[PDB]
Design a protein around this ligand. Sequence first.
Ligand SMILES: O=c1ccn([C@@H]2O[C@H](COP(=O)(O)OP(=O)(O)O)[C@@H](O)[C@H]2O)c(=O)[nH]1
Length: 365
Amino acid sequence: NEDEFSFKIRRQIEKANADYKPCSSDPQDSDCSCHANVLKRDLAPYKSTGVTRQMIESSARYGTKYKIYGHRLYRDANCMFPARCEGIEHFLLPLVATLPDMDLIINTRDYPQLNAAWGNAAGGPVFSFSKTKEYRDIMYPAWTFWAGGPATKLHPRGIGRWDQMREKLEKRAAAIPWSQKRSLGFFRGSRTSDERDSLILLSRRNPELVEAQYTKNQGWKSPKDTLDAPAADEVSFEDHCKYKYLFNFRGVAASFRLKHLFLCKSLVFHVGDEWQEFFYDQLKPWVHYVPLKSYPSQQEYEHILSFFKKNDALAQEIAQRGYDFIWEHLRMKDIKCYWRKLLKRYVKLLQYEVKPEDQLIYIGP
Ligand SMILES: O=c1ccn([C@@H]2O[C@H](COP(=O)(O)OP(=O)(O)O)[C@@H](O)[C@H]2O)c(=O)[nH]1
């Protein structure tokens, strides 16, 4: 019983860290290649045929049309989520000076647009922040890296400033050494996916093992949105760092929580393997984090937390590498250059001449 489990996890770890190769030959990643595999596989379905003017106008129904013309940025007057457009635009604007013309259909909704099961209508290309193997959407660094992530009490203008968040969590990480972190699984968040229930129910059944509560979101409808319990408070990102075992679940799509959880130097438990942001591909299970299949049971949880509470040296090794990765390969520099290479390889696919369009508004610079 306990030993069978004990080994299985150990083989999986031994196997994983034996198999691991760094995302780049040197830590500085001068050529911006760490996540180059993702943009590669993402554009691929267009390599043979290219992007037609037709495909573009068709795909325009799937998001916010950006257009770079003669090194000037143009965008649909109406952006669905104004603050999200501002997050992306912080990134597009400095590149526009050195980019050729292109048309972009950028989806600022949480959920991807181009279902591969449908055909022809959903060929693309459309840019989204999060997808699964189901979707043809091209992945980009989300708006929240600069501004427009979830608005909360602690982040009234919506969570952002990754440059600032990094310095902040880094301090808090150094201040709270591993041994001083509480040996409890931690979570605080809203019921954006029922994959989160089992941890919350377990917490109510065993608070000494799991401290996990549902918060309230702006889409709250009834008591069901917190499994009939009183809405807990938002707890800050720095305050996560006092617990050893931090859980990350998908929401509508992938959650912004993940990247922040690593910089606590706590052990990140990532549930589900479906939903991605661009950098995830290089986040390797058992190396950087503990993997958990979607819809985990209360018993899965006890066994896995019990295992790591009983293998403290091993836990710490993982927390450390997980921290180092986000630290070394998710700097603002990594974000801007992914943006850069992505658009550069994308423009090459276009089989048509980008013409200006009057209904579009001038964005900058
Ligand atoms: O107590 C909390 C609850 C949420 N968040 C952050 O606010 C965002 C929204 O999280 P929520 O669970 O509400 O939705 P998600 O985006 O995770 O599906 C995420 O980036 C969380 O990391 C936080 O820092 N503290």
